[PDB]
Design an enzyme around this catalytic site. Structure first.
Site, PDB file in Angstrom:
ATOM      1  N   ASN A   1       0.866  -1.180   0.000  1.00 35.79           N
ATOM      2  CA  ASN A   1       0.000   0.000   0.000  1.00 35.79           C
ATOM      3  C   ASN A   1       0.900   1.227   0.000  1.00 35.79           C
ATOM      4  OD1 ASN A   1      -2.675  -1.407   0.619  1.00 35.79           O
ATOM      5  ND2 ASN A   1      -1.392  -2.089   2.325  1.00 35.79           N
TER       6      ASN A   1
ATOM      7  N   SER B   1       2.438   0.392   4.095  1.00 38.02           N
ATOM      8  CA  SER B   1       2.215  -0.856   4.824  1.00 38.02           C
ATOM      9  C   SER B   1       2.048  -1.961   3.782  1.00 38.02           C
ATOM     10  CB  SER B   1       0.963  -0.763   5.703  1.00 38.02           C
ATOM     11  OG  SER B   1      -0.212  -0.702   4.906  1.00 38.02           O
TER      12      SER B   1
ATOM     13  N   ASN C   1      -2.483  -6.748   7.658  1.00 40.01           N
ATOM     14  CA  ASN C   1      -1.666  -5.550   7.512  1.00 40.01           C
ATOM     15  C   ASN C   1      -0.556  -5.303   8.539  1.00 40.01           C
ATOM     16  OD1 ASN C   1      -1.533  -2.248   7.813  1.00 40.01           O
ATOM     17  ND2 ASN C   1      -1.665  -2.943   5.685  1.00 40.01           N
TER      18      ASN C   1
END
Length: 130
Positions: free
Chosen positions: A46, A51, A60
Site C-alpha cells: 500500500n 504498509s 496488515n
C-alpha cells in the site's frame, strides 16, 4: 500454497475457527477467498501508507505483524510478517483470531464488509464435511 476450497475449510475447522467469537467457518472462508484467493503467499503493498498486507487473510503490517519497514507500525500479533507467508496457516489463524478479539470482529477487513456481510456464504463450505 494455494488451498483448494474444502481443503481450507477443514484446515480452518481443525484450527478452531468454526464459531470463533461468533464467526462461522463460511465467513472465514468468504474472507480468505476475497482477500487472497486462498493463497498463503499473496502480498499487497500500500504505497499510500507504506504498509503491506500478508498471506491468506491479507493481514496488515501497520498494526498486526512486524516487517521492520512500516513507519510507526505496531505488532499486535507479535509475529514477523514472514510467519504470515508460510504454507502452514497456524500462525496466520492465531493472528486472525487476535484481530477479531478487538471490537470490530470480522468487520476488521473491509473486503468482508464488501463481499461477505449480509451475503449468502453457505456456498463456501457446502460439501466440505465441516
Amino acid at each position: 500454497k494455494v488451498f483448494e476450497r474444502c481443503e481450507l475449510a477443514r484446515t480452518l475447522k481443525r484450527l478452531g475457527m468454526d464459531g470463533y467469537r461468533g464467526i462461522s467457518l463460511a465467513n472465514w472462508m468468504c474472507l480468505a477467498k476475497w482477500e487472497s484467493g486462498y493463497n498463503t503467499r499473496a502480498t499487497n503493498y500500500n504505497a499510500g501508507d507504506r504498509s503491506t498486507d500478508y498471506g491468506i487473510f491479507q493481514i496488515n503490517s501497520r498494526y498486526w505483524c512486524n516487517d521492520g519497514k512500516t513507519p510507526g507500525a505496531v505488532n499486535a500479533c507479535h509475529l514477523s510478517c514472514s510467519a504470515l507467508l508460510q504454507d502452514n496457516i497456524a500462525d496466520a489463524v492465531a493472528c486472525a483470531k487476535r484481530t477479531v478479539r478487538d471490537p470490530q470482529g470480522i468487520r476488521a477487513w473491509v473486503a468482508w464488509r464488501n463481499r461477505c456481510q449480509n451475503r449468502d456464504v453457505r456456498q463456501y463450505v457446502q460439501g466440505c464435511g465441516v
